[PDB]
Amino acid sequence: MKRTFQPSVLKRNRSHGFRARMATKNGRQVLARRRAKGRARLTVSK
Template sequence: MKRTYKPSKKSKHSTHGFRKRMQRKGGRKVLNARRRRGRHKIAMSTPRKGHYR
């Protein structure tokens, strides 16, 4: 049987990344809440092109 979860940093960034969060009102609320809380990382750090390892 195949596994249902096949982790990929590329797809994770496209759904949970900073730029995706900024596109929607709810995502901006998430970022601001994380800023208020003092989180070191407010979103997944965006990788440079070709650095998805």
């Protein structure tokens, strides 16, 4: 039936995109944790 993931790009990027993280203290802490674990990509970007 209608499942849980109905994808949208504009949605995806406003919610989790780079800039969206950088907006806030918490977000920059996420990006800190990721850079510390050494991910391939931090956020969802194209």
